Amino acid sequence: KESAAAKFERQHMDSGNSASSSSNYCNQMMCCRKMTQGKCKPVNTFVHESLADVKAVCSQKKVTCKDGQTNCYQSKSTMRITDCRETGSSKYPNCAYKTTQVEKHIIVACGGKPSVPVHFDASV
């Protein structure tokens, strides 16, 4: 059961970095998207194109996955994406990520019916 003091810190404190800079994107998103629970997911990519555009990748260029599986696809064009990589400083439960925005091609694994993206494999 959360103490009132802890609750206040959770709901009202953010000195770990003011509401300033886009350098904080990853720290906030990785937390919002639940990838800092029990462990700091070391690396993650966020795509900003439409869901439709990313889904459309399942029907674009075929490429093998890094794990040998053969259900990977590469986007025909670059996409605006955001790279999140835990920083040396970061140490769970104090996850720190470096935000790096680039427009690259993405490789994803597709599955299910209809076949949609189910795994981000890499950006190229």
Place this chain on the structure above:
Amino acid sequence: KESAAAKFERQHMDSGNSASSSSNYCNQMMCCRKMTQGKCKPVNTFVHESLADVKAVCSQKKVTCKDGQTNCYQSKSTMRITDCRETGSSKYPNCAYKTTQVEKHIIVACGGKPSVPVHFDASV
């Protein structure tokens, strides 16, 4: 059990134009700090000053809380804070907030032992 497609969207999709825009702060923080679970917390303020500085308020100016309780204190100095308000468009499970940065004195209820902030009452 979250579907593979659902998980991909959670872990990798953030469609939009101003991804890391400060105008997105509240949407990301309100989500990260869990104030969008079950429903959208209508209003919330995040203080960007030092935890030590905010706790210090508890030994500053005594004031009566907005709800009539008598354990509120107001900061002597203004503090950098971000105001978060749910937008007319926002409606669970699709919470949306307007981010507003300003500098004001904060009023918080203090309790427990040691006496520390346990509730954000108001800013002014």
